[PDB]
Write a protein that binds this ligand. Structure first.
Ligand SMILES: Cc1c(S(=O)(=O)Nc2ccc(-c3ccncc3)cc2S(C)(=O)=O)sc2ccc(F)cc12
Ligand SMILES: [Zn+2]
Length: 220
């Protein structure tokens, strides 16, 4: 998150911190959010050999009594996901057991969005900056789809265009898979943008994918 503020600890209790063992070699990190006791919603590009989810966290180098750290037992990547265009950049993760609902660990609820939205994550705080140890959040403006016309594979039906280009406020690297909320409702999933961090960025439009989500939930 660039231009954001350190979240009030545990104020976004749906937030998940994903530790992904990449199918080939090293470890990477994404965001995500808990939508049922044993399901996390994230980006398809965050898939890997295996994934761990940490719930209840604020500072991800500091274990707390709030934490619940859970292995992923099944990855449901969108079947039409495209590694090149990032169409359908959405993935459900089934957890090995159900999270305990606590003040610090809760599910996020699910009708057309307004302009001022908010995203949170532990990603980089600037182009060439480290990840944040602490959860950061920022308010971003939902833009018309034209504002993203420069992304050749953008598609208004599948995707939100997020972040006023005049400001530096943006989701960035490491913020993948985290939710965009508009009026307390989850509308987007951080997907991609410019590697120089100039907004807007591209998020997955969650409403488009609601039948697929319902299908996976109802059946697992
Ligand atoms: C994740 C990410 C990157 S990245 O540079 O880490 N990865 C990235 C960047 C661009 C694209 C892409 C470009 C053109 N068309 C489709 C996808 C893809 C990928 S990724 C996440 O697939 O490596 S830059 C950026 C900017 C804003 C943001 F919210 C998220 C991101
Ligand atoms: Zn705490």
């Amino acid at each position: 998150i660039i231009g954001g503020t350190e979240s009030k600890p545990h104020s976004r209790p749906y937030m998940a911190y994903l530790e992904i063992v990449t199918s080939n070699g090293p470890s990477k990190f994404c965001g995500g959010f808990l939508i049922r006791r044993n399901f996390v919603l994230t980006a398809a590009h965050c898939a890997g050999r295996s994934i761990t989810v940490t719930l209840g966290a604020h500072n991800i180098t500091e274990e707390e009594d709030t934490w619940q750290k859970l292995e992923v037992i099944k990855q449901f990547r969108h079947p039409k996901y495209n590694t090149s265009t990032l169409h359908h950049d959405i993935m459900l993760l089934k957890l090995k057991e159900k999270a305990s609902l606590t003040l610090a660990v809760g599910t996020l609820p699910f009708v057309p969005p307004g302009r001022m939205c908010r995203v949170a994550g532990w990603g980089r705080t600037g182009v060439l900056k480290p990840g944040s140890d602490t959860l950061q959040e920022v308010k971003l403006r939902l833009m018309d789809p034209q504002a993203c016309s420069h992304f050749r594979d953008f598609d208004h039906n599948l995707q939100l265009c997020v972040g006023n280009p005049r400001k530096t406020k943006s989701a960035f690297k490491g913020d993948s898979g985290g939710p965009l909320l508009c009026a307390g409702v989850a509308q987007g999933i951080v997907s991609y943008g410019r590697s120089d961090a100039k907004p807007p960025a591209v998020f997955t439009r969650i409403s488009h994918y609601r039948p697929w989500i319902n299908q996976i939930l109802q059946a697992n």
